[PDB]
Amino acid sequence: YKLICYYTSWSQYREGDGSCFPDAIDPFLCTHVIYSFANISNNEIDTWEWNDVTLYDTLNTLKNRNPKLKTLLSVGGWNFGPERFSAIASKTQSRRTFIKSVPPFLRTHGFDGLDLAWLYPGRRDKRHLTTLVKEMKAEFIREAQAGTEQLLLSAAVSAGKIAIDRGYDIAQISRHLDFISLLTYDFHGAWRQTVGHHSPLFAGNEDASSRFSNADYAVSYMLRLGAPANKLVMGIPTFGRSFTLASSKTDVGAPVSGPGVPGRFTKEKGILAYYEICDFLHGATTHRFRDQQVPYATKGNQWVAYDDQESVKNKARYLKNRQLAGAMVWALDLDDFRGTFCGQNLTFPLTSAVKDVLAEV
Ligand SMILES: CC(=O)N[C@@H]1[C@@H](O)[C@H](O)[C@@H](CO)O[C@H]1O
Numbered sequence: 121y122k123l124i125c126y127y128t129s130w131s132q133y134r135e136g137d138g139s140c141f142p143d144a145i146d147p148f149l150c151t152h153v154i155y156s157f158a159n160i161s162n163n164e165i166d167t168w169e170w171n172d173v174t175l176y177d178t179l180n181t182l183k184n185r186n187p188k189l190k191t192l193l194s195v196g197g198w199n200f201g202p203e204r205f206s207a208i209a210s211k212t213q214s215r216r217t218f219i220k221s222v223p224p225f226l227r228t229h230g231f232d233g234l235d236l237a238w239l240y241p242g243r244r245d246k247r248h249l250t251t252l253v254k255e256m257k258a259e260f261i262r263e264a265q266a267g268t269e270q271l272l273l274s275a276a277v278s279a280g281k282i283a284i285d286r287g288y289d290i291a292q293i294s295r296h297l298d299f300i301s302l303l304t305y306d307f308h309g310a311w312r313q314t315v316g317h318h319s320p321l322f323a324g325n326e327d328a329s330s331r332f333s334n335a336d337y338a339v340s341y342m343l344r345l346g347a348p349a350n351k352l353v354m355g356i357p358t359f360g361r362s363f364t365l366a367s368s369k370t371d372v373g374a375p376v377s378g379p380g381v382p383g384r385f386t387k388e389k390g391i392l393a394y395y396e397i398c399d400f401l402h403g404a405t406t407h408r409f410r411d412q413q414v415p416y417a418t419k420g421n422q423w424v425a426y427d428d429q430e431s432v433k434n435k436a437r438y439l440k441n442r443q444l445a446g447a448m449v450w451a452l453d454l455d456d457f458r459g460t461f462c463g464q465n466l467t468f469p470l471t472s473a474v475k476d477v478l479a480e481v
């Protein structure tokens with residue numbers, strides 16, 4: 121099984137224990153580690169933070185300890201406009217420029233592959249998104265003629281039924297991608313004035329309609345669309361989403377007035393790192409959606425949807441039972457990487473939990 125783990129560059133600026141560097145990563149934890157967000161400049165893949173080539177370096181040395189490790193640089197991201205991605209893909213010229221600029225870049229920095237994080241292509245981009253994947257992979261094939269191991273190519277893909285139908289020619293791009301990562305953690309959130317869990321596993325017979333909003337549906341659909349199970353990798357979050365309640369109500373559907381207060385370390389509203397969630401639990405009331413098998417806690421006017429060790433192990437058994445290629449953990453830097461925030465001293469509890477399951481039969 122594969123364990124694709126994301127590391128975000130901007131997690132370096134978090135204060136105190138929040139601060140996270142490539143060197144803080146267990147090199148035997150994952151099978152592939154993806155560095156979060158390179159940019160695009162003058163149609164050429166480029167760096168983002170000032171000290172990226174230093175961190176690229178830090179990160180890639182981990183292979184000195186674990187030679188089986190593979191690293192990938194991911195382009196796009198959120199703070200990266202999809203229009204930009206769009207303007208580039210639609211002009212065979214600007215597109216071709218970008219492509220020819222990629223191999224050398226990764227080769228110079230020690231990466232084994234590129235990861236496309238085009239964040240949500242439109243109805244208009246589907247055709248181009250396909251061309252990009254194709255020609256890009258055609259380039260990676262032609263560049264291995266030089267005797268070096270062929271660079272890998274992957275994409276982080278939306279898990280929303282509408283999004284998939286709108287801008288993804290799945291049957292086509294599965295043939296060129298070494299693996300596809302499903303963003304199976306963005307089902308609630310996106311501003312929706314009722315409370316809810318963002319990464320539910322199952323449907324759960326409750327205040328329904330959103331039938332397609334759960335890893336399980338997302339997955340089945342991908343398979344129905346022609347994507348081979350051995351190329352699918354299911355996303356498992358390491359963060360929780362918060363909500364400032366609008367009333368003393370807590371159960372499903374409870375009214376929400378806006379996102380939650382920021383985490384002292386992550387400083388972004390509506391989101392809490394697993395380790396911050398570990399601290400939050402103290403003095404909180406835990407709950408479990410038995411139908412969807414994912415928990416939530418509450419304390420004061422704060423409601424949090426998150427994933428813990430059991431929920432995570434569960435999703436892990438699931439992908440194994442449907443025979444997928446593996447799991448994907450978003451934000452290794454949001455897990456208890458120091459292993460000193462969540463009690464029982466284990467470094468990277470959530471990711472470890474997943475690894476243990478993947479390591480059983
Ligand atoms: C963080 C950073 O460096 N971003 C730059 C930015 O000036 C620009 O939006 C983009 C377009 O060329 O190029 C990026 O590399």
Ligand SMILES: CC(=O)N[C@@H]1[C@@H](O)[C@H](O)[C@@H](CO)O[C@H]1O
Pocket residue numbers: none
């Ligand atoms: C639209 C965009 O994001 N690109 C900006 C551009 O306005 C700026 O002049 C240049 C570097 O200074 O690249 C980015 O900073």
